[PDB]
Design a protein around this ligand. Structure first.
Ligand SMILES: *Cc1c(COP(=O)(O)O)cnc(C)c1O
Ligand SMILES: *Cc1c(COP(=O)(O)O)cnc(C)c1O
Lengths: 415, 416
């Protein structure tokens, strides 16, 4: 059971082996445009497959409850130091188990149940964790939301009025389906004017920010949270960045507040991902992410679709499908049949029900990771439009699927 | 390239992290681990969590996902669910919790509101941080009443019953991180029912023993049973909630969209592997050995003049009262560590020492048993520990024990 020769997934658990093999193949054989998805490196995966899963290391480097933490301390401190370097942060906590736990760490440190918070409207591109009434963020706190103006940019003037009316203890900024640069400096001014903390959840944009191709919230915010996966291209998990004055409450909130033993193998994987993100090659990658998203958007507009906000300045776009008389749900299904993975998403003032929608969200991080360039981004844009224009036509779906197969064979994810 | 498995190795990409991992692998070999919450998980479990399943966003549940493309991760998660239900006889399960802490928090988010009253076992008497500490969520946002041990150092069920009637808790937590005896879950369920409270049993420490049928199963008696997948269950690091079917909907909703986002599908694959291992006859043999080795270790320490809190062990764990040897828990932990025996200090009931000093150490057998120790080695270990406790500052003693420990760790490698 503990011989690495005999204890292989195939020998121990053939069913789980088979499912993993089919998932490996599924990742190769579909073009992934879900904007929150990426492919992480073999080195990152190897780190989280390590024996570091065996170590209980409650506490912090040099300040652990148990002995024997000399080497996991080196690992965690490298992760902290590198993520501080990436974002210019005064302090960091690399223990959060997920983006959700990173956000909850800030809330636990700084708020009490019933306190008022502001966040971006879910209907307008905010995330579940930014105040949904079925998420902790909204169930146990009093939430006021701000959204977009008529031009489909953030309505900063409206946000300012709401902040003055409701006096939130904390303002959340960031989004999961918003294509433009967010004015973090302006949001910091608004927060300061009412005595609120500013927390920026940069999960979608963190990789772009690390590469300098999207604005950095760190100089402006009290707290910045993120996933380590998504555009940062790391393992699944979370990070809190914070001003030095908040180092003690934040660290205390993560442990012993809301977590126990950190996942040290995942933290090793975070450290590896941060080393990758510090490299010149990562900056080139993110430049390509931005270019590919722009080209994809441009192509869809040429084919008669509309981009919410009118343009992208990031990795992501929300496509208004109404000109093609197809719902987001129907588009997602037809594209999936053609081996293009997207997700439905409501648009501002969507006429359709919430599980139907009039939009799809698309992002470039994953296709860019597997090597697509602008010529491929354009091809993909045209293949999408081909499906949208005849979504139930077997021949169309088959033609697109065949073209997708040529692309996925030419651009394998893992070698 | 950055995505060529030939070139993207830890050693090539991140030599500093590679070096630290190699040193940790060596550290695991070279010490005898007696921390009762520690174990060594299998190469197959590690391989699963090193897989490409880390790339998949799979918010929601099997067949009920937000995104497409979840056919294969659905197979994985449902296998995990089915196997853990089979292991414990549970009516329903949620295998998404990121940790034991998140498993507990899922139950609280589902069933309680801030300010509600809960009961849990006293931390001073063997309860866990997550059972109501004022600096943990469990205690900061809820009103906590604790119950503890009687004069015999067993749970004072009569006192727990009186407290439940006085305080009318919405939910009673049972389970412990430093308690050696069988807990009477049936009795606690009667107490909870009598005041209309939910019973949640946090079985993290005991879960592997329970799966093997060598410690009592709380599942027939509790509304909710939470656990880690690591510790005695010997899986990857993460959590599980087991629940009566009538609570399936609130529990699942509480985990997602309530307190988590995308599940860690690679870790869930690793959980499924660990559960398959736990279903095997070899795992039952392992847990029988865990119980035997803990008993032998305890017996040996008693022969050498130490005392076991509660007077005996009925599980994988023991709390050793060190007072007869005039040594603190802190001092014992340090001296043993110098001799390559890893333990942790722990307060005893009515400890005369300050909280970071203590009069006890906690010891457990899961890890040493995993690497192949039997009763002869458990007895040797007991004697080596006593040798150190009797002369903790004596260089010759520490060195002699270290040499003996090195013979044992070379004989019983963790990974081959
Ligand atoms: C995906 C996401 C999260 C949650 O991350 P999980 O690791 O899925 O818990 C939080 N915030 C934002 C903006 C996200 O996009
Ligand atoms: C270790 C433990 C936990 C916490 O598990 P983590 O995975 O470290 O969050 C909860 N309850 C008990 C009884 C434990 O022993």
């Amino acid at each position: 059971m503990f011989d690495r020769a005999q204890s292989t997934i195939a020998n121990v658990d053939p069913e789980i082996f088979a499912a993993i093999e089919q998932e490996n193949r599924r990742q190769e054989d579909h073009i992934e445009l879900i904007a929150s998805e990426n492919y992480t490196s073999p080195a990152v995966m190897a780190a989280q497959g390590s024996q570091l899963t065996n170590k209980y290391a409650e506490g912090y480097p040099g300040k652990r409850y148990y002995g024997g933490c000399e080497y996991v301390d080196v690992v965690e401190q490298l992760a902290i130091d590198r993520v501080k370097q990436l974002f210019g942060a005064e302090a960091a906590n690399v223990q959060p188990n997920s983006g959700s736990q990173a956000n909850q760490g800030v809330f636990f440190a700084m708020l009490k149940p019933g306190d008022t918070i502001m966040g971006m409207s879910l209907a307008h591109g905010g995330h579940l964790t930014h105040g949904s009434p079925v998420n902790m963020s909204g169930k146990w706190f009093n939430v006021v939301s701000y959204g977009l103006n008529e031009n489909e940019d953030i309505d900063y003037d409206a946000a300012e009025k709401l902040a003055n009316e409701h006096k939130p203890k904390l303002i959340v900024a960031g989004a999961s389906a918003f294509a433009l640069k967010i004015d973090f400096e302006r949001l910091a001014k608004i927060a300061k004017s009412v005595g609120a903390y500013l927390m920026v959840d940069m999960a979608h944009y963190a990789g772009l920010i690390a590469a300098g191709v999207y604005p950095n919230p760190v100089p402006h915010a009290d707290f910045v949270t993120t996933t380590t996966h998504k555009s940062l291209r790391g393992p699944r998990g979370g990070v809190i960045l914070m001003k030095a004055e908040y180092e003690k409450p934040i660290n205390s909130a993560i442990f012993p507040g809301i977590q126990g033993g950190p996942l040290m193998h995942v933290i090793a994987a975070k450290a590896v991902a941060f080393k990758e993100a510090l490299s010149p090659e990562f900056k080139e990658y993110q430049q390509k992410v931005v270019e590919n998203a722009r080209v994809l958007a441009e192509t869809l507009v040429k084919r008669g679709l509309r981009i919410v906000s009118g343009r992208t300045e990031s990795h992501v776009m929300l496509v208004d499908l109404r000109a093609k008389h197809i719902t987001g749900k129907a588009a997602e299904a037809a594209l999936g049949a053609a081996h293009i993975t997207v997700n439905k998403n409501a648009i501002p003032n969507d006429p359709e029900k919430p599980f139907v929608t009039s939009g799809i969200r698309l992002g470039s991080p994953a296709m860019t990771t597997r090597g697509f360039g602008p010529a491929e981004a354009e091809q993909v844009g045209n293949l999408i439009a081909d499906v949208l224009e005849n979504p139930e036509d077997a021949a169309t779906i088959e033609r697109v699927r065949a073209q997708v197969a040529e692309l996925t064979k030419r651009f394998p994810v893992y070698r």
